[PDB]
Design a protein around this ligand. Structure first.
Ligand code: BCL
Ligand code: BCL
Ligand code: BCL
Ligand code: BCL
Ligand SMILES: CC[C@H]1c2cc3[nH]c4c(c3C)C(=O)[C@H](C(=O)OC)c4c3nc(cc4[nH]c(cc(n2)[C@@H]1C)c(C(C)=O)c4C)[C@@H](C)[C@@H]3CCC(=O)OC/C=C(\C)CCC[C@H](C)CCC[C@H](C)CCCC(C)C
Ligand SMILES: CC[C@H]1c2cc3[nH]c4c(c3C)C(=O)[C@H](C(=O)OC)c4c3nc(cc4[nH]c(cc(n2)[C@@H]1C)c(C(C)=O)c4C)[C@@H](C)[C@@H]3CCC(=O)OC/C=C(\C)CCC[C@H](C)CCC[C@H](C)CCCC(C)C
Ligand SMILES: COC1=C(OC)C(=O)C(C/C=C(\C)CC/C=C(\C)CC/C=C(\C)CC/C=C(\C)CC/C=C(\C)CC/C=C(\C)CCC=C(C)C)=C(C)C1=O
Ligand SMILES: COC(C)(C)C(=O)C/C=C(\C)CC/C=C(\C)CC/C=C(\C)CCCC/C(C)=C/CC[C@H](C)CC/C=C(\C)CCC=C(C)C
Ligand SMILES: CCCCCCCC/C=C\CCCCCCCC(=O)OC[C@H](O)CO
Ligand SMILES: CCCCCCCCCCCC[N+](C)(C)[O-]
Ligand SMILES: CCCCCCCCCCCC[N+](C)(C)[O-]
Ligand SMILES: CCCCCCCCCCCC[N+](C)(C)[O-]
Ligand SMILES: CCCCCCCCCCCC[N+](C)(C)[O-]
Ligand SMILES: CCCCCCCCCCCC[N+](C)(C)[O-]
Ligand SMILES: CCCCCCCCCCCC[N+](C)(C)[O-]
Ligand SMILES: CCCCCCCCCCCC[N+](C)(C)[O-]
Ligand SMILES: CCCCCCCCCCCC[N+](C)(C)[O-]
Ligand SMILES: [Cl-]
Ligand SMILES: [Fe+3]
Lengths: 300, 280, 240
């Protein structure tokens, strides 16, 4: 039987320049090439892309953050390319030491460069958030994407900005490095008495696992009713078809209740944002209110 | 009770076993043979959990913990109070999970839809058996499996992880995490996109899928498509669980040192392994 | 007591309300629950029916308000098996033709789905300027074979989802000259043939026809897709 995981026959037509609405067409690129590779799994068309002031600012600010970390890695490598590749994952740009507190007066080689990199990352992320809002606004769509994005920004802001400030030291922030930021994750737990016993950490996991649970359910469900065009969900919301009915009835007969075509995407957006929403809270409280989650757990 | 559109679908047929003996519903739930099987394994499993609670001396659900047999018992049987209950409960759980999957298949047949859902559920089952069966057997003792307790099974994760230093450095463990993160990223984006189209700005008419394509092309220059994202989410979630079972079946079986040592084959290559400077 | 214990209690309260909201939101279709005789069920659950919400459909196609008075808007050829509730309802006639069970179809609008510009979302490739087969086997010309290993026709065209650039149906020319649409998700394109495991060669003619050779309405799609998916259960007797 055909499973509909990979397209059997690809079809290609004139490129789709996309809806206009109130989008400033001056800032849209030309269409890119078609990818027969991607055509087997999804759409083959690449581009066009929208590049405005926020996009340019975010892209440029982002590359500076990347380049700031870069020159530091080359400096740790002694400017030797061989050493650069050998120890690439071990290089790390650390925040200032605790002795500098929240001051920006740390010299470049003792966390001053980390502060610069963090600035470029701050401008890149937030300008990109403003991008996801204005792109939705230009097309007249809701701002669900932007609000869903904030939940990720919330954990990111806590990890390296809000929580360090409340602790009173940039040294509480995370370092820029592949392995180093893993070690920072490991020590953060040990210092704070086992994050397994941070309830907002357990909730965060329930929603991470729950995200993989729900999307496997939903992805499998839509492919199972794609033989009825189930993936055309907007028109199934406006005019319920046998796809939506069979999908709902499968889960009703299975676990006792079911969703609608629209309602399942509210389960989805909430299951996913709650991951970084609960997570940001758990980290914010660690060290500011609770020094030992295991001990704190025994009194409750 | 039925949904307004449900009756026309409640036809006979589609079973795999028992013909029309168990081909009926209890409220919303469809029974079928494997529904009876599920109820049987479940009820027996819970009884043995309650029984273990009596032997343990507590009925607080946050303290109940059914432990597997001690390492000295190897892969043989153990008395009920010394790990036999964990063994029987594990059999029951496995029977219930499988029966649940075969029940889903009967429901797929009666609705004339694909079998993607139970197929995806089997990945979860695989990961469970990886921790409670495949890995213990390959290591030669049931004691290596994890205990059935709300909190004692988290300690097992912590004990098992730290036996190999920082488990983060397990390369398969990285890949699995990446799929879990990327999955929640894709799930949030998908749900937000459909809702943003079906619920536009005030004073706007419902959007079309073309708006969804156009939004994501304007944003990152590529749209995967209405069909491709559901394929994608199915593959991100299953791949996440696949490499999760992979990163554990190899731990303690073909890899015994700390996982950070696994990354020395890159550091220590005889050409650049000696060049002075750098971290190493 | 402390700021941590209060935060975790506040969240659980927040989460209970969120589940409540999410659940009522997922009751805008199919509710209120009915008895098997169509009358409203006495037990509707602990969650109340949500308050109506309105979509303004594009292209001047009206407004949908959900929840609202439900209706199948079509006859159902089923009869009860038991006096007690919870048992199957057996087809009274031909389930594939009566469109019941796995052959069910919903009385959707007898209008084609439109793209963002007001044009038909699905068109035969012979009416889609510029579209072609860019990868994989081109099924046009190939013979179509049923689960009985007999030939029912040959592919004559592909109906494509233009905005998505996706093949959705095969147009198959039967032995009598007429054509029928086959869901792309139910066919198997091979090197020398197209094989349809869901139907037997002599059941292709029964596939509902379309009233326009260059467009297919939502209703027609549901009737076509349901019939074909229904063959899996109801065409099994003569399946080799
Ligand atoms: C997966 C890798 C590890 C592991 C590591 C962790 C870590 C680390 C954490 C958890 C957490 C949890 N784990 Mg564990 N867990 C494992 C295997 C399991 C198995 C199993 C049968 O294999 C089960 C049932 C559970 C169950 C649970 C929940 C108590 C909790 C939230 C999970 C969740 O929402 O998931 C997504 C599922 C859903 C959203 C659907 C709802 C599922 C509900 C929540 C499951 C309830 C099970 C019930 C308590 C036990 C069975 C009842 C029987 C009738 C007797 N774990 C293995 C050993 N698990 C978190 C926690 O808070 O623990 C206290 C946590 O921090
Ligand atoms: C020894 C290690 C510790 C531990 C220490 C921690 C710490 C410390 C943290 C977590 C956190 C998390 N842990 Mg824990 N964790 C442990 C054990 C576990 C176990 C387990 C089976 O035992 C599991 C399943 C988890 C699971 C999880 C997640 C639920 C959670 C991360 C949320 C998330 O999505 O972050 C990923 C998402 C983000 C970080 C959001 C970032 C968004 C930003 C804005 C995007 C940046 C874009 C960038 C600039 C672009 C780059 C390039 C692009 C191409 C342009 N942990 C043990 C006990 N864990 C986090 C948490 O919230 O805990 C409550 C956290 O901080
Ligand atoms: C949540 C707790 C910890 C943490 C613990 C882990 C663990 C544990 C793992 C990662 C992994 C990764 N982390 Mg980290 N990570 C944290 C915060 C971050 C932040 C951030 C803005 O705060 C960034 C940019 C990253 C970046 C990354 C990538 C190098 C990689 C895959 C991410 C991914 O799938 O993204 C989404 C995917 C795409 C955009 C594509 N981490 C916090 C501090 N991270 C994995 C890895 O491979 O590390 C080398 C891994 O094993
Ligand atoms: C101190 C702890 C160590 C560590 C040691 C381990 C160990 C040890 C393990 C993991 C495993 C995992 N870790 Mg790690 N890990 C750590 C840090 C992390 C961090 C982090 C941010 O720091 C992250 C993101 C992760 C992420 C993860 C995942 C890749 C994986 C767990 C998911 C899984 O397998 O699900 C798979 C899903 C299941 C097993 C659930 C199956 C459910 C069954 C089939 C059905 C249940 C039905 C239920 C009972 C019915 C009840 C009905 C009720 C009505 C609800 N780890 C640290 C460094 N990690 C685990 C793994 O890979 O397991 C394979 C594992 O064993
Ligand atoms: C809220 C739950 C999950 C989530 C959601 C999320 N992420 C998002 C969004 C949303 C809703 C966006 O709208 C935004 C985006 O445009 O995605 C395509 C984004 C985004 N999430 C990204 C990454 C990312 N998200 C992550 C995690 C998560 N994102 C959570 C698991 C992670 C990690 C570490 O797990 C990473 C690495 C970017 C691809 C993108 C933001 C791009 C950006 O800020 O670029 C600026 C930098 C340069 C241009 C250079
Ligand atoms: C494989 C990708 C992800 C996934 C997918 C997935 N799960 C699924 C499905 C799919 C596609 C289903 O169709 C099926 C379902 O119906 O979901 C609603 C299911 C399901 N996933 C579930 C849970 C679950 N999935 C998880 C994970 C995942 N599921 C993956 C991340 C997790 C975790 C820990 O991450 C959990 C907890 C169930 C809600 C449901 C299966 C229900 C089922 O099998 O019911 C029959 C069994 C019973 C009714 C009870 C049996 C009880 C036992 C006899 C005794 C107890 C055994 C257990 C060992 C106790 C230990 C408890 C402690 C560890 C706390
Ligand atoms: C697009 O189309 C879709 C739908 O329709 C349109 C959906 O509806 C769904 C379903 C999804 C949801 C409703 C979202 C909420 C679900 C979550 C968060 C998953 C987590 C689920 C739970 C926590 C609930 C788990 C439930 C159970 C384990 C069931 C309890 C089991 C019981 C009572 C026993 C089972 C009964 C029998 C075997 C029969 C009885 C036997 C006898 C012998 C009497 C999806 C995915 C979808 O794509
Ligand atoms: C040839 O190579 C060249 C040289 C070209 C390169 O460029 C190679 C470079 C690389 C390969 C770089 C590789 C990059 C990494 C390994 C980085 C890895 C990153 C992480 C693991 C993520 C860590 C991020 C977490 C933190 C700590 C985020 C902090 C964000 C804050 C919210 C911002 C804080 C703001 C501050 C301090 C002040 C700014 C101003 C304000 C008003 C707020
Ligand atoms: C090749 C250039 C592309 C660059 C990629 C940037 C990085 C994105 C990474 C992960 C998120 C996964 C994105 C896929 C989520 C799409 C959300 C969705 O629902 O899309 C459906 C469809 O696009 C509506 O028509
Ligand atoms: C911390 C942020 C988490 C909240 C995200 C919740 C998203 C649902 C609300 C979407 C509202 C969209 N709207 C109406 C403004 O267009
Ligand atoms: C949006 C879907 C909501 C799903 C709710 C799942 C609840 C999981 C409970 C996990 C228990 C967490 N805790 C606090 C005990 O550590
Ligand atoms: C995580 C535990 C909570 C999940 C419970 C799921 C609900 C089961 C089915 C409810 C409907 C049953 N009812 C009332 C119609 O008999
Ligand atoms: C119903 C099929 C079950 C297959 C796998 C079940 C896992 C059993 C694990 C414990 C075995 C204990 N044993 C064999 C020593 O009695
Ligand atoms: C042996 C691993 C676990 C087996 C449990 C049974 C899973 C359900 C069967 C999957 C149905 C899907 N398919 C395509 C195989 O028919
Ligand atoms: C006394 C401290 C209280 C902390 C409350 C934490 C849980 C509240 C979460 C609500 C999130 C709502 N929102 C805006 C993201 O949709
Ligand atoms: C039982 C008390 C509940 C108090 C908390 C209420 C939770 C609100 C849930 C979010 C509402 C969803 N919305 C409209 C923001 O998308
Ligand atoms: C994490 C899952 C959240 C709990 C599930 C809530 C379902 C409750 C509603 C069940 C009743 C449905 N019914 C019978 C009225 O159709
Ligand atoms: Cl822009
Ligand atoms: Fe969807």
């Amino acid at each position: 039987e055909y499973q509909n995981i990979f397209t059997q026959v690809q079809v290609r037509g004139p490129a789709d320049l996309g809806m206009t609405e109130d989008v400033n067409l001056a800032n849209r690129s030309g269409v890119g090439p078609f990818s027969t590779l991607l055509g087997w799994f999804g759409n083959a068309q690449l581009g066009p892309i929208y590049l405005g002031s926020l996009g340019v600012l975010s892209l440029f600010s982002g590359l500076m953050w990347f380049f700031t970390i870069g020159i530091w890695f080359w400096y740790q490598a002694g400017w030797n390319p061989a050493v650069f590749l050998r120890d690439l994952f071990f290089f790390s740009l650390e925040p200032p030491a605790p002795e500098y507190g929240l001051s920006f007066a740390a010299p470049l080689k003792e966390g001053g460069l980390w502060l610069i990199a963090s600035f470029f990352m701050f401008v890149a992320v937030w300008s990109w958030w403003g991008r996801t809002y204005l792109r939705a606004q230009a097309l007249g769509m809701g701002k669900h994407t932007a609000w869903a994005f904030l939940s990720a920004i919330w954990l990111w802001m806590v990890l390296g900005f809000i929580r360090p400030i409340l602790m009173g030291s940039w040294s509480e922030a995370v370092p820029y490095g592949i392995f180093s930021h893993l070690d920072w994750t490991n020590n953060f737990s040990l210092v704070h008495g086992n994050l397994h016993y941070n309830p907002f950490h357990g909730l965060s996991i329930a929603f991470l696992y729950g995200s993989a649970l729900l999307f496997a359910m939903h992805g499998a469900t839509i492919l199972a009713v794609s033989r009825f065009g189930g993936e055309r969900e907007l028109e199934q919301i406006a005019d319920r078809g046998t796809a939506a009915e069979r999908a709902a009835l499968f889960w009703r007969w299975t676990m006792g209740f079911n969703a609608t075509m629209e309602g399942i995407h509210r389960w989805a957006i909430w299951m996913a944002v709650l991951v970084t929403l609960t997570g940001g809270i758990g980290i914010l409280l660690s060290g500011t209110v609770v020094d030992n989650w295991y001990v704190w757990g025994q009194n409750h | 009770a039925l949904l307004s559109f449900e009756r026309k679908y409640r036809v006979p047929g589609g079973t795999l076993v028992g013909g029309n003996l168990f081909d009926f519903w209890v409220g919303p739930f469809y029974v079928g043979f494997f529904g009876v099987a599920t109820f049987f394994f479940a009820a027996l499993g819970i009884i043995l959990i309650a029984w273990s609670a009596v032997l343990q001396g507590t009925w607080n659900p946050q303290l109940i913990s059914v432990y597997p047999p001690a390492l000295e018992y190897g892969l043989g049987g153990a008395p009920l109070a010394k790990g036999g209950l964990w063994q029987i409960i594990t059999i029951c759980a496995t029977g219930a999970f499988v029966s649940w999957a075969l029940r889903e298949v009967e429901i797929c047949r009666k609705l004339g839809i694909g079998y993607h859902i139970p197929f995806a559920f089997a990945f979860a089952i695989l990961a469970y058996l990886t921790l409670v069966l495949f890995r213990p057997v390959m290591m030669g003792a049931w004691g290596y499996a994890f205990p059935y307790g709300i909190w004692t099974h988290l300690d097992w994760v912590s004990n098992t992880g730290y036996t190999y230093g920082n488990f983060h450095y397990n390369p398969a463990h990285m890949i699995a995490i990446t799929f879990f993160f990327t999955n929640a990223l894709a799930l949030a984006l998908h749900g937000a996109l459909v809702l943003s189209a079906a619920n536009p700005e005030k004073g706007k008419e419902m959007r079309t899928p073309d708006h969804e394509d156009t939004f994501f092309r304007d944003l990152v220059g590529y749209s995967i498509g209405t069909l491709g994202i559901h394929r994608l989410g199915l593959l991100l979630s299953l791949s996440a669980v696949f490499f999760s079972a992979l990163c554990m079946i190899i731990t303690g079986t073909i890899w015994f040192d700390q996982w950070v040592d696994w990354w020395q084959w890159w550091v220590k290559l005889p050409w650049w392994a000696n060049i002075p400077g750098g971290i190493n | 007591f402390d700021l941590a214990s209060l935060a975790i209690y506040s969240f659980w309260i927040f989460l209970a309300g969120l589940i409540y909201y999410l659940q009522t939101e997922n009751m805008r279709e199919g509710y209120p629950l009915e008895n098997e005789d169509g009358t409203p069920a006495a037990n509707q659950g602990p969650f109340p029916l949500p308050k109506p919400k309105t979509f303004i459909l594009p292209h001047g196609r009206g407004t949908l308000t959900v929840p609202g008075p439900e209706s199948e808007d079509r006859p159902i050829a089923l009869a009860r098996t038991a006096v007690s509730e919870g048992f199957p309802h057996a087809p009274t006639g031909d389930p594939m033709k009566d469109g019941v069970g796995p052959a069910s179809w919903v009385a959707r609008r007898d209008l084609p789905e439109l793209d963002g510009h007001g044009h038909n979302k699905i068109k035969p490739m012979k009416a889609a300027a510029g579209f072609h087969v860019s990868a994989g086997k081109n099924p046009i010309g190939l013979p179509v074979r049923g689960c009985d290993l007999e030939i029912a026709g040959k592919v004559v065209d592909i109906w494509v989802d233009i905005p998505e650039q996706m093949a959705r149906f095969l147009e198959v020319e039967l032995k009598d000259g007429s054509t029928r649409l086959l869901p792309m998700q139910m066919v198997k394109v091979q090197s020398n043939r197209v094989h349809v495991n869901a139907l037997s060669s002599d059941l292709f003619a029964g596939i509902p026809t379309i009233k326009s050779p260059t467009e297919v309405t939502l209703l027609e799609e549901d009737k076509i897709c349901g019939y074909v998916a229904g063959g899996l259960m109801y065409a099994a007797p003569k399946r080799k």
